[PDB]
Symmetry: C2
Subunit: 390 residues, 2 copies
């Protein structure tokens, strides 16, 4: 069964598209054929988003896969919710409960605030990139009212690439107006590494400082640059490489051709690429269940223009959303369960902390049992020579 | 000269449309005729925004007038900036410098922060609705880093109409 599906990959995200093709290798079947309509367009231009959206609406696809920007979170929720096409995304969680939104990145603030409750911080700086939204920024300020916090939030995303060198030296000096030692970063993996290299330039990676990286890719960043400086670096990892099911992927992942699968011939993988591979496992089990439902969803490809007034929905795509939210599969990100809105539940975030030996787990995050500390204890191998001032 | 123009008024904003018609009374002329294409649609649904937008693009209007939501600030800047149609809005200021955006509400943070500098406040609560954006919320936190402020910001826009009494 050839099933036309979406391919709205942002340009420059080909490692995700590489592991998407591994999902096309691993999870294709003769029971039904996945037919991607690959459109490598920029996710920022909502006009260009709308063009590849309505072309696949003119194609008559039964599901659409791709990322979404904050420039397109107002697009995809308004377009897929009206035309009743289920959309599968590995991007950031939405602000509101929108229908036809199946997300692969779970919530982070529950693991994030429990970590700050673990560290028991009261005054700490919080740099943030506005590009992934501001809901986590809204999340920390709601706890700042309750926990009497004195968090200093400063946006960093509007700083140009030419002068992200001198503004940052101005920035941490302004953090030394408060003499902060506790900075939780909220940036992209490149923008994380750029600012840490500026911390390297000024030397605030020394002992006395503490940093927390607020993403699921704590192992994705470069930890060797600041492993031996003195500051203690914490973070979250949803894709734990110690699993053999992950290790079976990695043993294939490094042996993948870089020229055929760009970004694949590596030792590790981004979590965004892993969730892209995890999403194909969900989509395969979906149409295996839609075959198990024996429900003919084969709407014709003549859905036509999305600018039909009124634009009629197609009711089989509503049932696709009903079965997608009932898909419960194990993947690289662990146990996957959904709500009635497409949000991931029963997931488990592994809190990883960089130590002298490397990144090491102190505990996993649970949705109902928030922080359960792992007693994997080598006692840090020492006592780190307690500083006695006089 | 009959000049086709836009009419994307949000529903329930008819006092604005009333004074729009007074502008049609006061500022119409025989030198050129304003031809409104009035589309009273909800500004939240960006799909419905796109329908009345491209219908006026199919109309061939020379300018488009109407409001924009924060659900459509990512729409109108992406659509009017690409199709190169000038857009006139009385809505809130944009976050970025976008072309073809003519705004009627000016900036507020320069008057706002100077007022707090007048009152010389250091710790003060700041309730905010997220529906007009968060740039002013970003504005006060940038001054909070400089002026050592202890501002408590709490969102209020997500509270339902049924229980906006006990919360």
């Amino acid at each position: 069964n050839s099933i036309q599906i979406g391919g709205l990959f942002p340009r420059g995200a080909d490692q995700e598209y590489s592991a998407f093709r591994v999902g096309m290798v691993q999870f294709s079947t003769s029971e039904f054929r996945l037919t991607p309509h690959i459109d490598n367009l920029e996710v920022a231009n909502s006009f260009a988003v709308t063009n590849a959206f309505c072309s696949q609406f003119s194609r008559g696809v039964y599901a659409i896969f791709g990322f979404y920007d904050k420039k397109s979170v107002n697009t995809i929720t308004s377009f897929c919710g009206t035309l009743h096409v289920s959309f599968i995304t590995p991007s950031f969680p939405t602000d509101g409960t929108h229908p036809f939104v199946i997300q692969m990145r779970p919530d982070l603030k529950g693991a994030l605030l429990s970590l700050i409750e673990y560290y028991q911080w009261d005054k700490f700086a919080y740099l943030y990139d506005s590009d992934r939204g501001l809901s986590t920024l809204q999340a920390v300020l709601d706890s700042a009212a309750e926990k009497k916090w004195q968090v200093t939030a400063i946006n960093v995303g509007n700083i140009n690439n030419d002068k992200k060198d001198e503004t940052y030296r101005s920035l941490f000096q302004d953090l030394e107006l408060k003499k902060e030692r506790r900075v939780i970063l909220d940036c992209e993996r490149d923008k994380v590494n750029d600012i840490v290299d500026q911390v390297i330039t000024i030397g605030k990676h020394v002992k006395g400082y503490h940093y927390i990286i607020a993403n699921l890719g704590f192992t994705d960043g470069d930890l060797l640059k600041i492993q031996f400086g003195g500051a203690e670096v914490s973070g979250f990892q949803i894709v734990d490489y110690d699993d053999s099911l992950v290790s079976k992927f990695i043993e294939r992942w490094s042996t993948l051709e870089e020229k055929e699968y760009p970004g694949a011939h590596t030792a590790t993988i981004k979590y965004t690429s892993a969730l892209t591979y995890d999403a194909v496992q969900v989509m395969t089990e979906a149409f295996r269940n839609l075959r198990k439902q024996r429900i003919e969803i084969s709407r014709r490809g003549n859905a036509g223009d999305c600018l039909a007034n009124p634009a009629v929905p197609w009711g089989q795509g509503v049932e696709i959303e009903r079965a997608l939210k009932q898909v419960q599969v194990e993947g690289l990100s662990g146990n996957i369960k959904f709500d009635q809105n497409g949000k991931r539940i029963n997931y488990t975030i592994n809190i990883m902390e960089l130590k002298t030996n490397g990144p090491r787990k102190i505990g996993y995050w649970s949705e109902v049992d928030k922080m359960v500390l792992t007693e994997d204890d080598t006692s840090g191998l020492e006592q780190k020579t307690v500083v006695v001032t006089t």
